[model samples]
Target chain A: AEEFPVPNGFESAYREVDGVKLHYVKGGQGPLVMLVHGFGQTWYEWHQLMPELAKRFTVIAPDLPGLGQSEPPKTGYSGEQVAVYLHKLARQFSPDRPFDLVAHDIGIWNTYPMVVKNQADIARLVYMEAPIPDARIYRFPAFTAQGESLVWHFSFFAADDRLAETLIAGKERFFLEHFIKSHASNTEVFSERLLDLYARSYAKPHSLNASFEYFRALNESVRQNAELAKTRLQMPTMTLAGGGHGGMGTFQLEQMKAYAEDVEGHVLPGCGHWLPEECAAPMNRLVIDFLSRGRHH
Target chain B: AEEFPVPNGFESAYREVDGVKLHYVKGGQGPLVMLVHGFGQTWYEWHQLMPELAKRFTVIAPDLPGLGQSEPPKTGYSGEQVAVYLHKLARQFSPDRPFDLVAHDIGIWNTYPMVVKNQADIARLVYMEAPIPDARIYRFPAFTAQGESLVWHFSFFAADDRLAETLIAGKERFFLEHFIKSHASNTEVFSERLLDLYARSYAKPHSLNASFEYFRALNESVRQNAELAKTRLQMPTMTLAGGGHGGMGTFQLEQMKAYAEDVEGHVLPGCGHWLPEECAAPMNRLVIDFLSRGRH
Candidate 1:
């Protein structure tokens, strides 16, 4: 938990929810606002945006189980299973009332099912920088230059026998840096200190296994999302995408348009896949104002 | 040069053609049969088939330039350039006649352009295993397990800044072994001896550069083939695809049907991409009979 700096007033702690030792940073006071981090990142992804969101609401950014300092998941890593695990934890902070949710990348995957299953409980949603597993993947590229850097890792990461992990075993730092920098517009933010922290975090026991499980679970996510698409979300949702070296540029927004009743979103100009880190200030203000809409209403 | 033995009575030698010092094994005496090797293999791929084909026809198998014992190409590694270089070497063996051609894998890429431009000179053609570059690549998978092992290497091998080569530098043996064994139905044929020879050859200076260039030139190959497709080949063509762990299974036969008028082919059961090594006997007899059709 001490691996990176914790923002002032944000107390770092852990809790046992449904038998999983969940690690989270909790602070501020108001309706619950949960921040879910993306792939290759832990709860630390929310460090910059936390303070701004904390200014208006109670905030909690928990590392998806088995990442960061959290213990590994006892159950499998499907969207439904993972969502249920985190949902129990979210209920602990605001048991009787619904909470606001903001999730990035794979975090978006884990929590999208949560929003779909309990549409009335969640008041607002912030989907960031990852595609909702859907039929669109059927048409993805298998053989070209654009396919290599963009989506080759989808299968490579999920390879059985730990093939991807095995090839990357000794070259953790080399690979993580390449993977990280290659997907970012603000590559400068990834300093040696941060990369070292991430490399070490990712290199830990079953660490990559848990991370890669997200990709391996995508087919199941696709199936679950397709069935759940029958019920549209009634809550206001804000989708964010990166424009500079960006992935899924406004893709999530387009997907949400079909799945939700009301959606407003933006492509952060000059930002990349690391939406939180690349455009933290805009993201913080935009998300803060978006989540605050109901308080005024 | 002594990395692998030459078939009995076949002489190991080299000759400069168009500024490339071509390495090859030549023996027997009759209508010339030139065997061009594929990716991750040398002329050594034909070691098993050479003796069989040698009984009736003169067989000459050359290490693709910069691949085995051969010197690097003076021009580039594009299909047109590579095919032209090999075409020049074939003329040295039999100056007056059009040579019967046998090519496997990327070797197929190198020689197809030759068959296209010199349809009048070539007598017969054996197109084995590798797909000709075409528009079908646009629909390739960007995100699935099937896409990983099947087509992932297309872009990885051609990556610039030597990304694939850099990650592969010290682990040449590991990656090559994985690459070779993965696509194979007769994976057991990739013995340590051959793997060792292939690894050492691949690690040689600019060896990877030359090989990778073949993939980098696929877009160009595609353009050329699209235009060349307008004129169907008049020569009798034999197409080969593996039935075991087959890549481009019957796909090549389907492709060649559109590009050539007189085409007959078979999928060798239990064979993989290594047609020459894995299914040598059937391939040799089948090819021998196909080339012999004219004489009969």
Candidate 2:
């Protein structure tokens, strides 16, 4: 509904999968890059990087399970299931071959299990602004507990639709303003329309509980990933850190090493978790390099 | 809480997961076999087989999702998500390692995701009763209008809470009676108290809807099992079929063969979907023999 930005030839498409209609914004026509968004955002969250990335590779960013124009059912909370949804997405978009994956925040939490369950579908992986904790930190709840204030949404959001609806609808604007403002290190990173987009998308109410389950799966992933370490992430992998808080500090690469044997990383100076908005060019460049590097052993 | 038959030592301690309170009922302590009940049945459904299986293996049966005494929440129906719940159950029981798994119906639906996600600390796997499908046939609407008529609950039960609550609660007794009575070819398959437990447990209006989501996940699991078929079910696997109307002669090993390489199965006689109940001893024997015969 917003201003159309893609080239005249590119278009948005919808696919009916598992009974739920999924809306995907696609451009370009080569290897696929399934870009997923975290909570409080939608496919538009990738708005800043879409054109540039689409120029080289087909960029398919969709609102994941519960968040955007997607159907808002609580069943989407399972990250592993969400991975299947991604596999379904892969089959629909590029059934002939594997595609590259670009994900952030909850998307990364969602992708970790995809790697564990469907590693073959991925050519290479690019995780932007999501942390991959070391096995020791993941196995123990204490280290992960520190983010509970922000993370409790994983549990709280899993509440029923009636409760979640009442809770989110009543505070849509407040949640959008507070949540978006919380992660943006610069004022230019957020806008009234951006907040409006988030507020309207979450207005569905049923998505709140599903979003909470998304975070709860994170703890489960930490435990599961430790066991998954036995399987190397054979695909080329890369992570781009935000410059501000939550960016890949020096320790981030050490954590990536636990999950991937072939991971390289870069940090955007003074940037923050809002990578798409704060540093789309460098972020897109890092992702393009990883995806184009090829999956050949 | 039916007159919990075993001594206190045979019981498992309890823990809270994502707000739901769950117990890991422990009986006998050798190779652990965690029994997860399907939607609408409590861990007690394992009563017929637990004591017998306990003879050689430690059995930990927990009320999965909203069933039994597990803390009830609003959602979390995905295999990867349920794997989190199952992991919590697995951790509470072993606390130090993985264990063998015995699951049926929706519980099997739940575990397929757990295995697909590669999280359950499962040493070996055994799926009793029905096998979930893959691709279009796995899609709920395509189960053939006839198959759908036989087990309409697959589609009907997934209605959101508003619809399920009214239909399910309005005739809770009849629903419980009909299923349990028919579950065993014989009427005595479920005792009066067992029927009472099922009714009272689902009486918590919220539980009915929660159970619906589990079925919804079954629709999701079919696709997941297809994904799961690709990796990690490398553990020794076996399946047993109950003659129950829902599962009678229908545990498809070929579809399962799609994912697991080393597998074998048996179809029990004179039993229905509740194989553990009508055929506990033989079913238990099948499990012990299969597990003892080979190790993965």
Candidate 3:
């Protein structure tokens, strides 16, 4: 935390509701733009882009419950469960004005549901990478080589036994490093110093297990998405996709169209799954332009 | 080797088929019966059962190529690939008389294909616990809790990268222990000394990689089984299933009927997956009776 720099105005803060404390970094007052993060990353993913977004609107980049420094909830770990609390957090923080949401990876899973339930309060949304769990995920291959390398962890992390947790216990640093480090093109943005913060948080007690809970609750999240997707989201939505070898490209854009009535997307070239970090510059430009467009239309 | 005793009559031996060396323990006399073993185990799994079968037959318990003390093939690890070598190993030992097959776990994957091609040479078949690779296996669950605990390793082992191999390194004993040990009814048969032998074998160079290749080639095995299931086996077949928790429980029996004719099955009343180990008495009784019936 000390070594990893935050933007000049951002400050660390916490908000607890129903025994689950949400840890976030907040600064720049106006309308609220809440940032939700995914596995192997925390609020720190937005350090580069937060200040820029904060200049336009109040920014709150939070480690969703059970990830990073946020206290885990006992109720459940499904995206819907996390979003239930998140919807409360987003509305409670900015009760007077509607807020915008920027989420990545599992963050998209947790945030997509929050917008689904509380569409009126959420004025804008930006989802990057990570598939929304649905029936389509079940069709992905596990037997094939291509499929296993791409998504083996879905089953491994969602495994019934504590096998993943047990095996990953002593090798937390190795596991975190391996998971976050990419051989994808233009991998210059990720620093060893920043990698240390993620590794440190995941290495803490019960951290891997808690994070894996999101995956174990995957079917429940799928069920929720399947039900809620029947009603398209009303908010103006923007999706950022990675166009490099390992990126989702326009996959998120195509899928988001099914869940939202108003959706726009951009494919950031030369970036992989880590769009926020690897291609933060282009992503910042697209995100700022899109979030600001929400007021006009 | 000294502490984990083989039966007095049995002798350790090896036979090289092509470039691959098959390490086995041989004993007794009369009609030949070849034992093919599964993952997390080797010829040692049959230590208790081999002696009893030795009284009536020339028993050959071999570590399938790449497992136990055997040498792996440079070609592939698909059950069909393993069987191409195993078939030669079985026939070379007993050129005059037909041999019988008794296989468990991944052994079934290797041996089922062996019997499919060489139905003329095999007199009978006994498959326990593990399913032969079929399209049915593809239907099993990966997302649900019930499914993940049962066969999560199918995907984990079949994974493309050396992720399983990478994470499992330096934790060979823990993996083998967790894999082989069960909270099932009669787990007392799995002694720590015995587990140490299995662990030691897996910890050796390239052991985990070689073993995992069997799963990676699962689709190939499935492809082979699908092609062969079109023609039913000529030999009588026996399947032993565990009724206890963690058991496949007649799952293999029902699936076996699709591929073989004249099939008979027994659900061992008080055991799990370690059929020969946990319920050796009943399994031995059923096996000896079934193998002897072949001569009749």
* Rank ordering of all candidates by DockQ, starting from the highest: 1, 3, 2
True contacts kept of each: 0.47, 0.00, 0.22
TM-score of every prediction relative to native? 0.88, 0.46, 0.81
Query: What would you estimate as the lDDT of candidate 3?
Result: 0.79
Better TM-score candidate (2, 3): 3
In model 2 chain A, the worst 10-residue window by lDDT is: A140-149
The TM-score of predicted model 1 comes to 0.88
Q: Which stretches of candidate 3 lie over 4 Å from their true place?
A: A16-21, A74-76, A112-117, A131-140, A145-149, A177-197, A216-273, A277-289, B19-21, B74-76, B131-140, B145-149, B180-197, B216-233, B238-272, B278-286
Query: With candidate 3 superimposed using the best TM-score fit, by how many Å does residue B31's alpha carbon deviate from the native?
Result: 1.2
**Worst lDDT window (10 residues) for model 1 chain A?**
A142-151
| Candidate 3 chain B: worst-modelled 10 consecutive residues by lDDT | B141-150
lDDT of 3 by residue, A1-297 (tens): 542456798888788867788788888878899888888878888888888887778888887787777889768988778888888887778997789988888988887777877788888888998788777666544444232434556777875556678778777766666665532445566677777778778767667788788888888888888897887898888898889855778788988888878888888888888888888899889999988876522
TM-score of the A chain in candidate 3: the value is 0.94
| Candidate 3, residue A28: how far the Cα is off, in Å | 3.5
Clashing pairs in 1: A140-B142, A141-B141, A141-B142, A142-B140, A142-B141, A142-B142
Candidate 1: stretches off by over 4 Å: A145-149, A185-194, A223-234, A244-246, B145-149, B186-197, B203-205, B223-232, B243-246, B268-271, B277-285
